[model samples]
Target: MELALRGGYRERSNQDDPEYLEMAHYATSTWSAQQPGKTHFDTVVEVMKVETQTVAGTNYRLTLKVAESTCELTSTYNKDTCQANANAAQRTCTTVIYRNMQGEKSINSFECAAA
Candidate 1:
């Protein structure tokens, strides 16, 4: 797969890979707090697709499911402290995160729709 996608984005067979999970968490952490008027904290439940590209920095594009958690925006941002709210809607989100050559990782963009 690496040879086939040389210098291009490659679809990952293991969408739920732990490394990707960490990126997903990082992408949502700021969103949970920075969202104006937001109260709930959403955490990734399942990852659907992950496409990665190597450039001056690594670009990670992920499509995933996120559910509202019992934890609020002000709560600790650990996923272990967040329990999915059974009655809340699940959102299907697509996000881009990038790790620069300097090894700084941050969310590039994120958007979601009720799923």
Candidate 2:
């Protein structure tokens, strides 16, 4: 599928490819984290990265942060507090995934152009 962000994408042509690649890797790693019988749910993963550079003499820095947990657990065995944990995950998953991408919490050197 073609994936594109609505804002701040300087070049949309190659964005889908990179996004897919990144998603693929993340999926693989997420599945690997599931320990099967030991735990149906993988531990929450929080990732943060900051990159700064000049492209065509325009200085731009991008920062990415993601906090994620697997959905596979909900399909598996029941555990205490599982529902609560899952609820928390759903409530803020996407935001946690991109919290540092924009606004006040942005870590990129681009100076928070994103809303």
Candidate 2's TM-score reads 0.21
- Collision pairs in model 1: none
Residue 34 local lDDT, model 2: 46
True-structure RMSD, every candidate: 4.7, 13.4
TM-score against truth, every candidate:
0.83, 0.21
Q: Which ten contiguous residues of candidate 2 have the minimum total lDDT?
A: 106-115
User: Among these predicted structures, which one has the highest lDDT?
Assistant: 1
lDDT of 2 by residue, 37-112 (tens): 6334432222123222222222122233222334454564222222224333321122111222321222111111
For model 2, what is the alpha-carbon lDDT of residue 46? 26
Q: Which candidate comes out best when scored by TM-score?
A: 1
Local error of candidate 1 at residue 35 (angstroms): 1.2
lDDT (Cα, tens digit) per residue for candidate 1, span 7-109 = 6788985434788877777777667678777897888787788998886778888888888777777678886677676677888899888777778877877
